[PDB]
Design a protein around this ligand. Structure first.
Ligand SMILES: CCc1c[nH]c2ncnc(NN3C(=O)CC[C@@H]3C)c12
Ligand SMILES: [Cl-]
Length: 167
């Protein structure tokens, strides 16, 4: 038993809710919150901008030090950093940005990072401002992640579409 509440069980291991991931994180304080990161960990907008704002920019400060030491992530890759006031850890995961021509097949690689964590709160990777169809992102998630994932979808109209088209 865990502290997540109000989710639709899509499968044995995937759950979904209409909520802002930032508010879910503040309420639950999960072990792992997933950020929809870019390779430079420049958290300007979308999920990343919202999470970073909620940390009062501490996420960005930590991220800039990470990049200065290690260089950029790979598309499809990830790193574990602090979750600051939102979670124990933040798993920064880079899904492909189809607006930049990046291979949508890399979305499966991106979701594979989730399997290194038993339970995660997460957004739909590559969707939103990253340009991919959220319906596709949800399907890849279900077909790739085997650990317990709680997906927060802020857009209510999209949530309804994701639910209705699922089975
Ligand atoms: C609007 C930005 C945002 C803030 N907090 C969020 N929490 C969850 N998802 C979010 N955005 N997204 C959707 O709602 C559908 C896919 C895309 C990632 C957000
Ligand atoms: Cl977004």
């Amino acid at each position: 038993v865990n502290s997540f509440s109000g989710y639709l069980k899509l499968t044995d291991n995937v759950y979904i809710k209409n909520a802002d991931i930032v508010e879910e994180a503040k309420k639950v304080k999960p072990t792992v919150v997933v950020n929809a990161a870019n390779v430079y960990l420049k958290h300007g907008g979308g999920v990343a901008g919202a999470l970073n704002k909620a940390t009062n920019n501490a996420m960005q400060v930590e991220s800039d030090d990470y990049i200065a030491t290690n260089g950029p992530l790979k598309v499809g890759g990830s790193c574990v950093l602090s979750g600051h006031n939102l979670a124990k850890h933040c798993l920064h995961v880079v899904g492909p940005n189809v607006n930049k021509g990046e291979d949508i097949q890399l979305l499966k690689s991106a979701y594979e990072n989730f399997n290194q964590h038993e339970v995660l709160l997460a957004p739909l990777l590559s969707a939103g401002i990253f340009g991919a169809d959220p319906i596709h992102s949800l399907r890849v998630c279900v077909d790739t992640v085997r650990t317990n994932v709680y997906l927060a979808v802020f857009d209510k109209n999209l949530y309804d579409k994701l639910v209705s088209s699922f089975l």
